[PDB]
Amino acid sequence: PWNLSNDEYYYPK
Amino acid sequence: GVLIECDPAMKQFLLYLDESNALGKKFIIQDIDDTHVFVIAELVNVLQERVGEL
Amino acid sequence: GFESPRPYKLTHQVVCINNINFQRKSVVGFVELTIFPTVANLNRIKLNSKQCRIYRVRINDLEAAFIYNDPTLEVCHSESKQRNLNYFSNAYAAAVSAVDPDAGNGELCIKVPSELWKHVDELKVLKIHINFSLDQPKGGLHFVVPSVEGSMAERGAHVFSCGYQNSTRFWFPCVDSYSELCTWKLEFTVDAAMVAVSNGDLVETVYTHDMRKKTFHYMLTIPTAASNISLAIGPFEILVDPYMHEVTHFCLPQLLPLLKHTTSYLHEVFEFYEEILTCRYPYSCFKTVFIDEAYVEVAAYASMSIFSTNLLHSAMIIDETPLTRRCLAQSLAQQFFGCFISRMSWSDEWVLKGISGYIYGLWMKKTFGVNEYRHWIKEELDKIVAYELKTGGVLLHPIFNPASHLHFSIKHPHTLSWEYYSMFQCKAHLVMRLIENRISMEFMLQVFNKLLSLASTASSQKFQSHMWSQMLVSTSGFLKSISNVSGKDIQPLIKQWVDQSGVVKFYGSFAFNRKRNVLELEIKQDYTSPGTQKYVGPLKVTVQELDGSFNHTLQIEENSLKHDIPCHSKSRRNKKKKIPLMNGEEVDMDLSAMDADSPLLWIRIDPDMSVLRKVEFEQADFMWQYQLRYERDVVAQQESILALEKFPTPASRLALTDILEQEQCFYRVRMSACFCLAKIANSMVSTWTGPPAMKSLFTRMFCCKSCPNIVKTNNFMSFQSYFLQKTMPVAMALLRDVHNLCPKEVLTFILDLIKYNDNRKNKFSDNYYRAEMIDALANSVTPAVSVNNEVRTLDNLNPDVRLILEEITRFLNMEKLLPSYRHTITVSCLRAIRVLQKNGHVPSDPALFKSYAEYGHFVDIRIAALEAVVDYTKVDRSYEELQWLLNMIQNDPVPYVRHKILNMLTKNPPFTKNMESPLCNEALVDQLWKLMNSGTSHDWRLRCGAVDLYFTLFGLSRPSCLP
Amino acid sequence: VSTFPLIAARPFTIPYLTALLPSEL
């Protein structure tokens, strides 16, 4: 129901 | 390759010749452990001359 | 340039519908077309019509003579003894081409009266007034009339237009092609308590003189095709969007709060699609209708979308919010690029499907993150390589057969198999991602904005198609607009991935040359398989060495096999320094497993998925473990999980367990690591030291600190440990002991997870977690040890299975009194009873599933019960159950259920062509040939499903089991 | 009937109302 992709740890910028 | 059994403190002696000799591409082709190294066949008799200083 | 295949040009069409009778399932109406002949001596005018009884036709108020014949009603003759499928496919393609409006043809042939020939030679207007009647439609308009008494608005009866592609001929006579654009005037005289939703904007709503009926007048000034015109008449609850005010949402009665919560996100979808493209939404209104017994889950017409009510959820329902959200998003993407910009031929359909799927993927990227985007792209690519290696290949943009490796003709959308249609849309959006890879994303959005801007300057003119054909896109026009905005042409990429119909297969293996410090890759292609083709372009490879991550481009010509790339130092093993990753960060790695002589940690062939490929790389197991742990790409973590199943060493168990314990890993990687850890644990029995896999980890993550066997009370507010918590016992139940039986330590753990479940404290529902608990109980069932075919009775039941059977009985009975959100526990318990019947535990009796497959049940229960009956008639070779299923295909009220029964009977067939079965009569061949020929003549999706079933059962040649 | 009795499946006239609607709210 939300983002749930830990994007700040895989693509930090 | 050519299996050569040596001393752990003496293994790095042949590694210094690898980065200094410009004859071929690379002297040591494979390093098993601290007491086993490999080599293109040609420098055992030449190494016997360096025993006088070693 | 667009030249019409029709000799006339249609300008305006009036569709008036009166007398919608819900008791008799009947509509009456007329249709008035305004055509301009482009060629003199027009004589006959050929229109499209199915199922409508044509009463009279008047051309310019003069009585005209029409003749009707539909060759697609009975495709082959009844007295032809042919029984092969290639004959039927050619005859069906010829029959569909004989009613095709994309040629000059059509089903209703009207003859122009003689006195109008001097009006038609000097090209002046003709106004054709047909009046028709649908007596009891089997297609097109679907009447959902419940059997509660009361008025038709009090019982909840409604009509909606169903079908796919050109299926508007099924409820009024038209020119049912996507290329005949005209303006529209739509009047519907419905009951006073009902509302009629359609395309355009509602100009007025007048009462009738008795005030018992009212007429809804719609006008559509944007020129759309007849195939984009829809209708939904019912007692709908109206809800104006509180954010965007031209958007109205219609639901069935008593479902207004679900509609309020569900359609509350749609303004963000509107804002996204209007800011990546720079055109505003082209239509003046937007209407979302939620209905019962829908054809597809989401249909998109001009200025209107028809969804099923099964998408409506409340605020406490998770695991359904993203699915409904993305259904709304792809309906809006098709509003932009399937309904406003239309198709010029049946070729150039890949353009529209690709643009719709590509901008919907951009929406998914922004909304759910780049990681969910990569996971979705990888699952679509795996889907297409599985389908293309299975059967032939999908050919985007064929040229008119061009694809003769497959049992249907690809000249028309209504002869395609449904799986081919799904894979067509899938491959179209992946090829559009490839075009974005060659020509950057901002230029791609500029292409789309140029197409939309040409269409919207075209959409306001009044000239009858002098300029209205700029709203139709083609392949050549799309490539020309790409070449206009970028200066590069993509003709090699178009020639490889569109015109050629194949995917590539890569087999890679490396060797590190220590002497010259190089990495010798060895990439060979399998190009002799039936689905494959040969790749000769460039290929990216990413090598992670100790000095960092380096990309290399390899030129893979036909005669190429060995590619020598250079390698860097290994001075980050001399000192302990951090090894820099693919992104800017750097980590501490345990380099004890790495080789001493090689610096390279892992290799990835084609990391960005820049080709349509299937890679089979041969790394070492420590390289797969390093790629699982320290990679910053989710597709590489997934492929390392997939490749670690072949290496059951304890270092791989440590790698997957460290992935499972790790938050700040993407959650769908941990959900895969559960099943990978279960498979590895099953393979290293008689070596496993401590407890079963993931149990201690479950008690560490999700149970109480003071009580290990009591689970914590449910708080599902994190949405990543919720998914991991509900997927971990399902994988944990696949554990097996040395005796091949599930251990009683994991089964007891699952039963204690079921008993101590308390959900009185979270703001979310528990139906999916409990349904997954039933799925975990079903996974633990091993086949029973029947002796001398002993009858399975209650006393000789397994002591393990009696607990499982008690739990699923309790769950199903409690669902009968307190139901779940979509009867998820009914579906899970029916699936588990079929699991217990598939092994020798419960008697193999289909009567329970036959009672759950009746008409009055929810559609998820119906398809789960019918899946159980299809599995039963495959295993027990039942003749009467197959006749039951074929009868249910012939006469069921819901056509989605008929399509699903044909689909499940194709996926899990009762016999294949290789099998000798008792169910290989001439009677079954005659029944299935009659089902292809007649019987399925009203749906275009049941007929392709019957063709698929006949192909799966009897093959392309003559049925063998026949005189 | 004594061991594992199942309540029989009855069809609804309108099944989406008993499926989709929440009961505790």
Chain D residues within 8 A of C851 when measuring between CB atoms: 8-9
What are the backbone dihedrals phi and psi of residue A11, each rounded to the nearest 5 degrees, phi first?
-130, 95
Angle at C798 between CA C797 and CA C799, to 5 degrees: 115
Tell me the nearest-neighbour CA distance from B21 into chain C, angstroms: 13
Closest CA to C146 of C292, C290, C296: C292
Cα gap C434→C503, rounded to integer Å: 13
The B residues from 3 to 32 touching C (CB cutoff 8 Å) are 25-26, 29-31
Counting CB pairs under 8 A, whether chains C and D reach 3 or more, is yes
Chain C residues within 8 A of B30 when measuring between CB atoms: 514, 597
Q: In Å, how far are C685, C729, C778, C846 from C735, measured between CA atoms?
A: 10, 10, 13, 29
Q: What domain range includes position B6?
A: 1-54
For chain C, how far is it from start to end, CA to CA, in angstroms? 54
Angle at C56 between CA C50 and CA C59, to 5 degrees: 105
Phi-psi region of C319 (alpha: psi -120 to 50; beta: other; left: phi over 0): left
Cα gap C865→C500, rounded to integer Å: 41
Q: In Å, how far are B38, C356, C565 from B19, measured between CA atoms?
A: 15, 59, 22
Chain D residues within 8 A of C806 when measuring between CB atoms: 4
Instruction: Count CB-CB contacts under 10 A for residue C870.
Output: 24
C-beta separation of C605 from C541 below 8 A: yes
Angle at C733 between CA C850 and CA C672, to 5 degrees: 100
Q: Do A4 and C719 touch (CB under 8 A)?
A: yes
Method for this entry: cryo-EM
Contacts of C492 (CB under 8 A, 6+ apart): C537
Chain B residues within 8 A of C517 when measuring between CB atoms: 26
Eight-state DSSP code of residue C780 = T
Tell me the nearest-neighbour CA distance from B44 into chain C, angstroms: 19
Chain C residues within 8 A of A5 when measuring between CB atoms: 368-372, 666
Report the b/e string of C15-33 with b at 16+ CB within 10 A: bbbbebebeebbbbbbbbb
What are the backbone dihedrals phi and psi of residue D5, each rounded to the nearest 5 degrees, phi first?
-85, 135
Residues in chain A: 13
Q: Give the per-residue SS3 of C529-584.
A: CCCECCCCCEEEEEEEECCEEEEEEEECCCCCCEEEEECCCCCCCCCCCCEECCCC
Eight-state DSSP code of residue C304 = E
Cα gap C339→C229, rounded to integer Å: 10
Q: Which helix (H) or strand (E) holds C816?
A: helix C799-817
Q: Do D5 and C809 touch (CB under 8 A)?
A: yes
Cα gap C694→C48, rounded to integer Å: 62
Q: Which residue from A5, A9, A13 is facing C372, i.e. has the nearest CB? A: A5
Which chain D residue's Cα is nearest to C312?
Answer: D20
- What is the pairing mode between strands C247-251 and C286-291? parallel
Instruction: Count CB-CB contacts under 10 A for residue C749.
Output: 23
Chain A residues within 8 A of C369 when measuring between CB atoms: 3-5, 7
C-beta separation of C161 from C232 below 8 A: yes
Q: Does C321 touch chain A (CB under 8 A)?
A: yes
- What is the pairing mode between strands C26-37 and C126-134? antiparallel
Cα gap C430→C493, rounded to integer Å: 12
Extended beta strands in chain D, E state: none
Cα gap C946→C944, rounded to integer Å: 5
Q: Do C367 and A3 touch (CB under 8 A)?
A: yes
Cα gap C717→C412, rounded to integer Å: 48
C-beta separation of C368 from C329 below 8 A: no
CA dihedral of residues C382, C384, C385, C387 (deg, nearest 10): 120
Contacts of C89 (CB under 8 A, 6+ apart): C407, C408, C409, C415, C947
Q: Which two tokens stand for residue C755?
A: 């008993």
C-beta separation of C729 from C747 below 8 A: no
Q: Does C255 touch chain D (CB under 8 A)?
A: yes
The A residues from 1 to 13 touching C (CB cutoff 8 Å) are 1-7, 9-13
Which chain D residue's Cα is nearest to C155?
Answer: D14
Q: In Å, how far are C650, C653, C684, C749, C951 from C689, measured between CA atoms?
A: 11, 12, 10, 19, 51
HSE-CB at C325 with a 13 A cutoff on CA atoms is: 21
Crossing angle, helix C767-779 and helix C799-817, to 10 degrees? Answer: 160
Cα gap C851→C812, rounded to integer Å: 14
C-beta separation of C519 from C599 below 8 A: no
Q: Which two tokens stand for residue C711?
A: 């689970």
Q: Do A10 and C321 touch (CB under 8 A)?
A: no
- All partners of chain B with 3 or more CB pairs under 8 angstroms: C
Closest CA to C128 of C139, C119, C136: C119
Instruction: Count CB-CB contacts under 10 A for residue B53.
Output: 5
Give me the helices (H) in C439-517, please: 441-458, 475-486, 491-497
Tell me the nearest-neighbour CA distance from C438 into chain D, angstroms: 46
Angle at C630 between CA C625 and CA C634, to 5 degrees: 90
Q: Which two tokens stand for residue C522?
A: 């060895």
Q: Do D13 and C147 touch (CB under 8 A)?
A: yes
Which residues lie across from C133 on neighbouring strands?
A: C28, C53
Chain C residues within 8 A of A9 when measuring between CB atoms: 632, 664-665
Burial class (CB in 10 A: 0-12, 13-18, 19+), C793: exposed
Tell me the nearest-neighbour CA distance from A13 into chain C, angstroms: 9
Contacts of C420 (CB under 8 A, 6+ apart): C394, C406, C408, C410
Q: Which helix (H) or strand (E) holds C655?
A: helix C650-660
Which chain C residue's Cα is nearest to B32?
Answer: C596
Cα gap C930→C88, rounded to integer Å: 11
User: Three-state SS for C108?
Assistant: strand
Closest CA to C776 of C753, C806, C802: C753
Q: Which residue from D11, D17, D21 is facing C857, i.e. has the nearest CB? A: D11
- Report which residue type is found at B3: L
Which residues lie across from C108 on neighbouring strands?
A: C47, C68
Cα gap C940→C413, rounded to integer Å: 9
Q: Which two tokens stand for residue C594?
A: 């790495």
Q: Say how many domains are in chain B.
A: 1
Q: Do C821 and D19 touch (CB under 8 A)?
A: yes
Q: Which residue from C310, C805, C856 is facing D12, i.e. has the nearest CB? A: C856
C-beta separation of C219 from C48 below 8 A: no
Q: Do D20 and C309 touch (CB under 8 A)?
A: yes
Residues in chain B: 54
HSE-CB at C283 with a 13 A cutoff on CA atoms is: 29
CA dihedral of residues C588, C592, C596, C599 (deg, nearest 10): -30
Q: Which helix (H) or strand (E) holds B51?
A: none
Interface residue of A3, A5, A7, A9 to substitute, partner C, most C CBs within 10 Å? A5
Give me the helices (H) in C891-956, please: 895-907, 922-933, 942-954
Crossing angle, helix C922-933 and helix C879-890, to 10 degrees? Answer: 10
Q: Which helix (H) or strand (E) holds C937?
A: none
Q: In Å, how far are C115, C350, C380, C464, C763 from C426, measured between CA atoms?
A: 53, 10, 7, 35, 36
CATH number, position B9 = 3.30.70.1220
Q: Which two tokens stand for residue C573?
A: 């093993």
Q: Do C596 and B30 touch (CB under 8 A)?
A: no
Extended beta strands in C781-884, E state: none
Residue C666: alpha-carbon gap to chain centroid: 24
Q: Do C258 and D20 touch (CB under 8 A)?
A: yes
- What is the pairing mode between strands C613-618 and C504-513? parallel
Q: Do C817 and D7 touch (CB under 8 A)?
A: yes
Chain A residues within 8 A of C665 when measuring between CB atoms: 6, 9
Q: Which residue from D5, D13, D19 is facing C819, i.e. has the nearest CB? A: D19
Extended beta strands in C60-125, E state: 62-63, 65-68, 108-111
DSSP output for C191-234 = ETT-EEEESSEEEEEEEPTTSSEEEEEEEEEEEE-GGG--EEEE
User: Three-state SS for C27?
Assistant: strand
Q: Does C370 touch chain A (CB under 8 A)?
A: yes
Eight-state DSSP code of residue C532 = B
Radius of gyration of chain D (CA): 13
Phi-psi region of C940 (alpha: psi -120 to 50; beta: other; left: phi over 0): left
Instruction: Count CB-CB contacts under 10 A for residue C524.
Output: 14
User: Three-state SS for C435?
Assistant: helix
Q: Do D11 and C816 touch (CB under 8 A)?
A: no
Cα gap C365→C858, rounded to integer Å: 33
Which chain D residue's Cα is nearest to C817?
Answer: D7
Helix %, strand %, coil % for chain D, to 5? Answer: 25, 0, 75
Closest CA to C371 of B7, D20, A11: A11
* Most distant pair of Cα atoms in chain B: their distance: 28
Cα gap C872→C850, rounded to integer Å: 11
Q: Which residue from A3, A12, A13 is facing C369, i.e. has the nearest CB? A: A3
Q: Do C368 and A4 touch (CB under 8 A)?
A: yes
Closest CA to C148 of C625, C921, C822, C856: C856
Counting CB pairs under 8 A, whether chains C and B reach 3 or more, is yes
Q: Which helix (H) or strand (E) holds C359?
A: helix C349-390
Q: Do C255 and D7 touch (CB under 8 A)?
A: no
Report the b/e string of C134-173 with b at 16+ CB within 10 A: beebebbbbbbebeeeeebbebbbbbbbbbbbbbbbbbbb
Tell me the nearest-neighbour CA distance from C516 into chain B, angstroms: 6
Interface residue of D10, D14, D18 to substitute, partner C, most C CBs within 10 Å? D14
Phi-psi region of C13 (alpha: psi -120 to 50; beta: other; left: phi over 0): beta
Angle at C5 between CA C2 and CA C11, to 5 degrees: 75
Q: Which two tokens stand for residue C31?
A: 């249709």
Residue C903: alpha-carbon gap to chain centroid: 13
Q: Does C633 touch chain A (CB under 8 A)?
A: yes
Counting CB pairs under 8 A, whether chains D and A reach 3 or more, is no
Q: Do C310 and D20 touch (CB under 8 A)?
A: yes
Cα gap C947→C355, rounded to integer Å: 30
Q: Which two tokens stand for residue C94?
A: 């010829």
Angle at C327 between CA C324 and CA C329, to 5 degrees: 110
Q: Which two tokens stand for residue C204?
A: 């007025």
Chain C residues within 8 A of A7 when measuring between CB atoms: 369-371
C-beta separation of C940 from C227 below 8 A: no
Q: Write the residues followed by a gap in chain D (C–N more than 2.5 A).
A: none
Q: Which two tokens stand for residue C464?
A: 């009858």
CA dihedral of residues C862, C863, C866, C868 (deg, nearest 10): -110
Cα gap C698→C730, rounded to integer Å: 12
Angle at C68 between CA C230 and CA C44, to 5 degrees: 95
Cα gap C393→C388, rounded to integer Å: 4
Residue B11: alpha-carbon gap to chain centroid: 7
Burial class (CB in 10 A: 0-12, 13-18, 19+), C770: buried
C-beta separation of C727 from C677 below 8 A: no
In angstroms, this model's resolution equals 3.3
User: Three-state SS for C238?
Assistant: strand
Cα gap C355→C350, rounded to integer Å: 8
Extended beta strands in C225-278, E state: 231-234, 237-240, 247-251
- What is the pairing mode between strands C126-134 and C53-59? antiparallel
DSSP output for C737-760 = -TTSS--HHHHHHHHHHHHT---S
Q: Does C371 touch chain A (CB under 8 A)?
A: yes
Q: Which two tokens stand for residue C381?
A: 């690519």
Helix %, strand %, coil % for chain A, to 5? Answer: 30, 0, 70
Q: Which residues of chain C approach chain B closer than 8 Å at the C-beta? A: 514-517, 596-597
Q: Do C857 and D15 touch (CB under 8 A)?
A: yes
Q: In Å, how far are C278, C332, C334, C377, C906 from C272, measured between CA atoms?
A: 10, 10, 14, 20, 39
Q: Which helix (H) or strand (E) holds C829?
A: helix C824-838
Radius of gyration of chain B (CA): 11
Crossing angle, helix C634-643 and helix C667-683, to 10 degrees? Answer: 10
Closest CA to C933 of C86, C91, C50, C49: C91
Interface residue of D2, D4, D23 to substitute, partner C, most C CBs within 10 Å? D4
What are the backbone dihedrals phi and psi of residue C235, each rounded to the nearest 5 degrees, phi first?
-85, 55
C-beta separation of C372 from A7 below 8 A: no
C-beta separation of C113 from C45 below 8 A: no
Closest CA to C188 of C16, C424, C8: C16
Contacts of C464 (CB under 8 A, 6+ apart): C9, C11, C36
Which residues lie across from C62 on neighbouring strands?
A: C59
User: Three-state SS for C955?
Assistant: coil
Helices (H) and strands (E) in chain B, counts: 2, 3
Q: Do C667 and A4 touch (CB under 8 A)?
A: yes
Residue C313: alpha-carbon gap to chain centroid: 20
Phi-psi region of C461 (alpha: psi -120 to 50; beta: other; left: phi over 0): beta
Q: Give the per-residue SS3 of C148-188.
A: CCCCHHHHCCEEEECCCCCCHHHCCCECCCCCCCEEEEEEE
- What is the pairing mode between strands B31-33 and C45-47? unpaired
- Report which residue type is found at C504: V
Cα gap C871→C675, rounded to integer Å: 25
- What is the pairing mode between strands C141-144 and C45-47? unpaired
